[PDB]
Amino acid sequence: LQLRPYQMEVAQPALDGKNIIICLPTGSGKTRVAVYITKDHLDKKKQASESGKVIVLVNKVMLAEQLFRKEFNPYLKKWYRIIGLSGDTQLKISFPEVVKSYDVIISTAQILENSLLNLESGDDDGVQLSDFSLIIIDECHHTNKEAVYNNIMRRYLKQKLRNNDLKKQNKPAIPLPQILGLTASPGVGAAKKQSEAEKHILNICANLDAFTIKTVKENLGQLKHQIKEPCKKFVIADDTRENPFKEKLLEIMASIQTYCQKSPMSDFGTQHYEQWAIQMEKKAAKDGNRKDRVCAEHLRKYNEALQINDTIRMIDAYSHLETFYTDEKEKKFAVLNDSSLKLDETDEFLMNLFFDNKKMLKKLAENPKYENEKLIKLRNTILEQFTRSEESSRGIIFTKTRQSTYALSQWIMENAKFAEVGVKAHHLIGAGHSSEVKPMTQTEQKEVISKFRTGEINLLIATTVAEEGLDIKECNIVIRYGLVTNEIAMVQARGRARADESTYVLVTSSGSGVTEREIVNDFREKMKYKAINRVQNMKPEEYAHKILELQVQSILEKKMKVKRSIAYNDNPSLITLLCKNCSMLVCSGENIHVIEKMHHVNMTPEFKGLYIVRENKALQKDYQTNGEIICKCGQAWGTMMVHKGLDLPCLKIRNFVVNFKNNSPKKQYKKWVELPIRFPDLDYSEYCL
RNA sequence: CUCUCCUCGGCUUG
RNA sequence: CAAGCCGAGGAGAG
Ligand SMILES: Nc1ncnc2c1ncn2[C@@H]1O[C@H](COP(=O)(O)OP(=O)(O)OP(=O)(O)O)[C@@H](O)[C@H]1O
Ligand SMILES: [Mg+2]
Ligand SMILES: [Zn+2]
C-alpha cells in the first residue's frame, strides 16, 4: 500500500499520465508499483466522473493465476472488482460481458487478440481498445517482430496515426489508453556495435510508444543495499583420458560405416555429422533404398550416445542405446507373433553387432578410474556450499536437455554424501510435446514449485523453464552447467541469487567456446547500459521525430509483408502413400478423411488388416486408450483414436512418402498443412450402408 | 537459408 | 489424465 523512494521516483512520470517503460532488477518490486499505479489511476479517474478500466497482459498462465490470487486481488478487492482469465478457465466464453462487468482484468494476450479479430471480421460482439483506460504489459521485452504483444500495439499505433490525420480534419480524435511497460532488461538483440544497440533500444521504445525509459539514477546506494549481487565465478575442467568406452563406440561406428561404403568428411561426435546422417536418411527414404536408411538411423543414435557421454556419465549413454535396441527387438517379435518368415539381413547385422559387445560396454562404463571432471567439479561446488551453510542453503542448476535433468537427479540420489549434508533435489522441465521426451504437466510444475517454496526440496535441476515467470524464493547458489543463451536470461538467472553471501558459478570444459560466449554477453551488457544512458538524455524533439519515423516504417513493412501472404490445387485421389522403410502401397489420397478439420483418419476394412497395435508406454508407467500403430516392417504409422463411440486410426505424415501420378518427384512434408492438397470431411454415408 | 535443441500460447477428440 | 492441430520466440551448427 506504500512505496519506497527508488520505486516512487520511477513511478512518478506515470502517475501524471505519461506512458513509459520501467526497468528494475529482478526482485525489486515491479508488481507493487503496478498495483499502486493502478489504484491511484482508478481513484483519480473516479474523481472527475470518467470511465476507468485497467487490463494487465501476461504471457504465461501460471503468472496470471498467481498475480491475481496473490497481489492484485487482496489489495483492491475492497474497493474495486477484480477478475482473472486464461485458456484454462471457462470464463472466456463471453469476454465482452466480463469487460463490462469488472474493472480490473488480468489475462493472457491471445484472448484479447482473438476478441479483436472477431470484431474486425467475425459476427460476434467483439471488443475494442478504446474501452480501456490503462494497459499494463509484463515482460515488455517480448514486444518484437511477430509476438502477440506487437500485433496489439500495431493496432494501437495505426489508431494513433489515424488520429493525427483526423486532427486537421474532422474532430475529435479517438481517445487511446495509457501504456505501462515493465521489465528487467530490454536487451540488445543481434548487435555488434554501439550504434546498433542504440537502434534496438529506440525500436523497443517505439513499439510501445513510450515517452522515456526511466531507469533508476539517484538512489543507487539504497537499491544496492537492498538487492545485493552475488560473486561471479568460473570453473574449468580438462581431460586427456576416458579412452576405452569412447574408443569402442568409435570402432563400432566405423564398422557400421564400412558396411555401406559411406565416409563423411566431418568428425565423429559433432552436429555436422548428425546433419549429414539426417540428410542421408532422408534421401535414401526418398529413393526407396533400404540398407542405407537404417544404417543412417543407427549412426545417428550412436552419435547421440557420444554427445551424451561428453556431458554426463557413460551408463546414461549405454542406457540410451539399450532402450532403442530392446524396443526394436520387441517390435520385430510382436510382428512375428503372427503366422514361413522372411528376415532382412542388414537389420540382423546391426542387431548382432550391438548384442555382441553389449557386455563389454556395460563392463567399461562401470569404472571409477575415469568418471568425468565436470561432474567432480560440480560435486565439490555443491558440497562446499551446502556444508558451509549449516542447513541454510537453496540452489538451482541450469541444464540444457531434459534427459540431463533426470540423470543428474539420479546421480545425486545414488550418492550418500549429498543426503548426509542435507541435499534434497528435484527436476523440472517443460510441457510441450515436441522434444523426444514426454513432457511434464502444469499441475506437477506447480507442485514442485510449492514444495521448493516450503522446504521439502532443497535444489532444483531445470532447463530454461525457470528463467522467468516462476515464483521462486531467493537462492544461495546458482550454477550453469554448460549453458549460455543470451544477455536477458543471464541477468534473470543472476538475479535469482539473492540471500546475502551468495555466488553465481559457471561450470564447463576448455575445448568448447562457452566461456567466450559468456564474456561476450558481459560486453553486451555494458553496451546496453551506455545506450540507455544516452537515449535518456536525447533532446525531446529529435526523439519524437525518430520515434515517429520508426513507427511509420514498422506499419509500412508489415503492410508489404502482408501483401504476399495472400497465396495448392486439390487432387486427393491423385496421390498415394508409401511406407518409408518397407516401401509399399499403403493407401490412396481418397480414403483419408478429416474430423473437425484437425484429425486425419482412414476407415476402410482392408486397412485394418495392415497394421498392429501396441500398448501405451506413457500410461504403462489401468487401461490402454491411444495405442501406437506399427507396420509389419516395424515402422510406426500413428495412433488410435475414438470418435462417437467408434475406434479409428490416426496417421502421422512424417512416416510416409507421397507419390504423385503425374511426374513422381517424390517428397516428404513433416506436417499436414504443407501438403498442398485438401481432404474431405467425415461422412457416415460411407464405410457402411 | 537449412537442420537440431529449448521454451510458450491458443484449440479439438476422448 | 491421454492423443492430435496450429502458431510464436531463443540458442547453436552448417
Ligand atoms: N513497497 C513494499 N513494501 C513491502 N514489501 C515490498 C515492497 N516492495 C517490494 N516488497 C517485497 O518484494 C517482494 C515482491 O517483489 P516482486 O516479486 O514484485 O519483484 P519483481 O520485480 O516482480 O520480481 P520478479 O521479476 O520476480 O517479478 C515481496 O516479497 C515483498 O516482501
Ligand atoms: Mg514480476
Ligand atoms: Zn511399413
What is the C-alpha separation between A226 and A221, in angstroms, rounded? 9
Cis, peptide link before residue A13, omega less than 30° from 0: no
| Distance CA A641 to C1' C3 in A | 7
Give distance CA A440 / C1' C2 (Å): 13
Q: Which of A469, A497, A423 is nearest to A231 (CA)?
A: A497
Q: Does residue A28 line the site of ligand 1, with CB under 6 A?
A: yes
Which nucleotide across the nucleic acid strands is nearest to A467, CA versus C1'?
B7
User: Which CA distances in Å does A474 have to A64, A419, A456, A490, A495?
Assistant: 21, 22, 15, 16, 9
Nearest to A328 by CA among A293, A299, A294: A294
Sheet of A82-84, strands arranged across: A20-23, A178-183, A134-137, A54-58, A104-108, A82-84
Does the annotation flag A582 for ligand binding?
yes
CA distance A395 to A414: 19
Counting ligands in written order, the one closest to the CA of A492 is 1
Q: Atom 26, ligand 1: which residue's CA is nearest? A: A27
> By alpha-carbon position, which residue is closest to atom 1 of ligand 1?
A3
Question: Residue A498 Cα, ligand 2 centroid: separation in angstroms?
Answer: 15
> In angstroms, how far apart are the furthest CA atoms of chain A?
90
Cell for A403?
534427459
Gap from CA of A30 to ligand 2 centroid (Å)? 6
Long-range pairs of A382-387 with CB within 8 A, sequence gap ≥ 24: A382/A418, A382/A423, A382/A459, A382/A477, A382/A479, A383/A417, A383/A418, A383/A421, A385/A476, A385/A477, A385/A503, A386/A418, A386/A421, A386/A422, A386/A423, A386/A458, A387/A421
C-beta of residue A325 within 8 angstroms of C-beta of residue A351: yes
The answer, yes or no, to whether any atom of ligand 1 lies below 6 A from the CB of A454, is no
Q: Sign (positive/negative) of CA torsion A442, A446, A449, A451?
A: negative
* Cα dihedral A252, A255, A259, A261 sign: positive
Task: Count the neighbouring beta carbons within 10 Å of the beta carbon of residue A250.
Answer: 15
Is A643 within 7 A of strand B by CB distance? yes
Q: How far is the CA of A276 from the centre of ligand 3 (A)?
A: 24
In this structure, how many other beta carbons lie within 10 angstroms of the beta carbon of residue A436? Answer: 8
Round to whole Å and give the CA distance between A269 and A623. 41
Nearest CA to ligand 1 atom 24: A27
The candidate with the shortest Cα–Cα distance to A510, out of A232, A233, A231, A240, is: A240
Any atom of ligand 1 within 6 Å of the Cβ of A659: no
A633 labeled part of a ligand binding site: yes
Kindly tell me the sign of the dihedral angle through the C-alpha atoms of A440, A444, A450, A455: negative
Instruction: List, in order, residues 6 or more apart from A78 with CB less than 8 Å away.
Output: none
Burial of A574 (0-12, 13-18, 19+ CB in 10 A): middle
Distance A33 CA to ligand 1 centre (A): 9
List, edge to edge, every strand of the sheet that includes A459-462: A231-237, A503-509, A477-481, A395-398, A459-462, A425-428
- Distances in whole angstroms, Cα of residue A600 to Cα of each of A193, A303, A516, A595, A688: 50, 34, 48, 7, 19
Which atom of ligand 1 lies nearest, measured to the CA of A184?
A: 25
Q: Which three cell numbers stand for residue A558?
A: 508489415
CA–CA distance, A108 with A138 (Å, rounded to integer): 10
Positive or negative, the CA dihedral A153, A159, A165, A171 is negative
- Answer yes or no: is the C-beta of A177 below 6 A from any ligand 1 atom: no
**Closest CA-bearing residue to C1' of B3:** A275
φ, ψ of residue A462 to 5 degrees: the values are -135, 155
